[PDB]
Amino acid sequence: AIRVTQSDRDLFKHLITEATSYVSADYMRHANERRTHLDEALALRGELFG
Amino acid sequence: SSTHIEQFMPVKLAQALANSLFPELDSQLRAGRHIGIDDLDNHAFLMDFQEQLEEFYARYNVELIRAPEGFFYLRPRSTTLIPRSVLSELDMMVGKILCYLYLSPERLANQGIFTSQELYEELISLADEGKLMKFVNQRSSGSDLDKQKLQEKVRTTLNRLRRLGMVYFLPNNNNKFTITEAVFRFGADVRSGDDPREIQLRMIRDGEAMPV
Amino acid sequence: FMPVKLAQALANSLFPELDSQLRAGRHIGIDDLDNHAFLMDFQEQLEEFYARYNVELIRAPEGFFYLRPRST
Amino acid sequence: LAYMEGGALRSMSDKALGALRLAVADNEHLRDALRLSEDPKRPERKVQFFIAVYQHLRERIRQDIIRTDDPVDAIEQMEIELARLTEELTAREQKLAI
Amino acid sequence: MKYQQLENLECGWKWAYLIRKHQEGEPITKYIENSAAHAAVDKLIKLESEPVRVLEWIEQHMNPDLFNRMKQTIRARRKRHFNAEHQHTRKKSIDLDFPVWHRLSALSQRRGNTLSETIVQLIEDAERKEKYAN
Amino acid sequence: MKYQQLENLECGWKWAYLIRKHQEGEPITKYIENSAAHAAVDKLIKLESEPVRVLEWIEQHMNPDLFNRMKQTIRARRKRHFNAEHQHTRKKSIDLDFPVWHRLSALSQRRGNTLSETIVQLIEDAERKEKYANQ
DNA sequence: CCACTGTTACATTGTAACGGCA
DNA sequence: TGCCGTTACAATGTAACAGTGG
DNA sequence: ATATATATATATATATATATATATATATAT
DNA sequence: ATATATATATATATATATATATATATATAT
């Protein structure tokens, strides 16, 4: 029982931490570049209108 | 490719059917024997390849069913390829009584080991002595000869249930026994808090229980 | 694992009925064309399969097949 | 993570994928989802895969008391159970020795 | 009907296409049970070198939803096979940067012409401008 | 270096490329003996979930022929993967008839510019004509 | 020099959508 | 309609050239 | 020129697994 | 109340695999 529970806990921990690391980073990356692109596009828009 | 097990059968089903435990389990199951947690090896084997065996037995028009209590068994269909049979009313009385003893804490001191005498005493305590005796013999009126006949009939029914796996005689004693969780099926008509006549219709529709 | 041709024989749709009738002791003669041909074809493995049950699959000189239970 | 740049995010995501490859080889459909998730043209796939991961660990719960379906929640209960088991193991080994 | 269809060729094409799809994991057969699908696929594998029976195999075990894709793939294969013989009938494949492609396609939908027709017209106009100047 | 090199991705790409080549029937191994080639291929198959060891498998059993095609395919795959993020960096594949392609290519080598550049000049001349018609 | 990288111009195969035609 | 040609793509693989830095 | 060490073959006999037969308990049925 | 069928356990014999010890031929040191 001890062995089984230890394995289960370790597996759960590893899977969760790695999935979060894998996904959230790309999510943040995309969020950041979308922010940056918006910032750039506003300057382009203002210059165009003038 | 050819000469390849997957051509015909899933790998796990073939492995299960080639296991040393398969034949005894299959013979017992087809005989009608229920499987409880006590037979650790057989129970674990059933758990591992539960799906393969249900689909295999489906070929016989019989459902391998695991009750919520965790005990497996077989329910044949009307088109069963394996014959089907129904327990006697006395068998039902004794099965309900055994479920009571399994759930009864008063006898906890017994620690699960029970004698046929105690079973008979509890049965007569909760049931109707003479009107139940009526079934043993139509001409019974409390005669002690017929009383012994009823005791003997109870013993025979107990032996039959032992054959079904609902009860185990002790490694050395055939006059003492230990109950198994399979007995819970005898309460399937009351495990659900609904009208008895609807649970009875549901059960008979499911093939769980025929009438008499 | 399992012998491949034994696996083929078990998978055959005739197997459930034939198995039930054998375990019921029924004797399969030449009249049952499909069952008799199936047994002829797959005897080498059904003999082993039913020996796993401590039973012997016997083909009589007349030709009909049957199961002889051992003591075990 | 907001502070860092795309390069570090990509690198650590690659490392996380490397860990996942090991952690997922056993599974077939989940492994397939992981493999599909790598297309840059459909980032949403990644999230889908993440959901599956939860939708996997959810079913790996053992018994009623660990039915904190949130996988991150079950960890503490499991650790408590390990400690408890340590004590029961001590008792049982002493019994066996005597 | 413009291109004559040859059985020993198109049937080999179909066998190769189905084998490729199976190797890709596509469910070739209509059988949900894995055993029947595997048996049919093995029959197909050993069915190599047979048009008259691969056709029957398709009729009997083929997945219903792939019929159209297989049909159009074979159409394209036939057309390409017949067109690849001569230079003038061959087709040259190129890759265009997204802005350039966007503008060129804008012109093509606007004028109702195809990419070939639109580019031909534009080049002809460029040549005509050269001649006007020259 | 313009494109970030990712090890756990390029390694997977390489493993997939090798597997694809083998299943296509090609002799990815450098071994002429059937048995050693089969063993190397089997180990490579086992290496599915360990792309890191794929580099070592390459250094141990990869056919000497494939270095150029490998470095080409993976370089192109990297470029395409990084370009697919944005549309304005994507590429569009089109097919051209032989006469049309012949004239266009002749014009491009005449002007000494790539096909996209020649198309840019042509469409820009047409749009300049449209603008001067408009003003 | 030399190697490795980025890029272009194809090829190769597959697919969906139109439109023609019996 | 059902087939059949046709177009415009997509995805990947290669050869060849141009750059880049040690 | 001799005698000892090696490898080979062989029978021994040891143990296991199988299959058979008998005795027993005992549960049924007349 | 007793004949009969069934399940269980034990002894006994068969057959096979395998390790052990010895005998025989050759090699190599003295």
Numbering used by the authors:
A (entry chain B): 248 to 297
B (entry chain E): 2 to 213
C (entry chain F): 9 to 80
D (entry chain B): 1138 to 1235
E (entry chain I): 1 to 134
F (entry chain J): 1 to 135
Quote what the paper states about this structure.
The ring-like structural maintenance of chromosomes (SMC) complex MukBEF folds the genome of Escherichia coli and related bacteria into large loops, presumably by active DNA loop extrusion. MukBEF activity within the replication terminus macrodomain is suppressed by the sequence-specific unloader MatP. MukBEF is the SMC complex of E. coli and other enterobacteria. Its SMC subunit is MukB, which associates with the kleisin MukF (Woo et al., 2009; Zawadzka et al., 2018).
We then reconstituted a complex of MukBEQEF dimers, MatP, and an 80-bp DNA oligonucleotide containing matS close to one end in the presence of ATP and magnesium ions. The MukBEQEF-MatP-matS complex is prevented from hydrolysing ATP and shows a state prior to unloading. Sub-classification of the cryo-EM dataset revealed additional forms of MukBEF-MatP with arms in different states of openness. The most open class has arms unzipped up to the elbow, and the most closed one is the apo state.
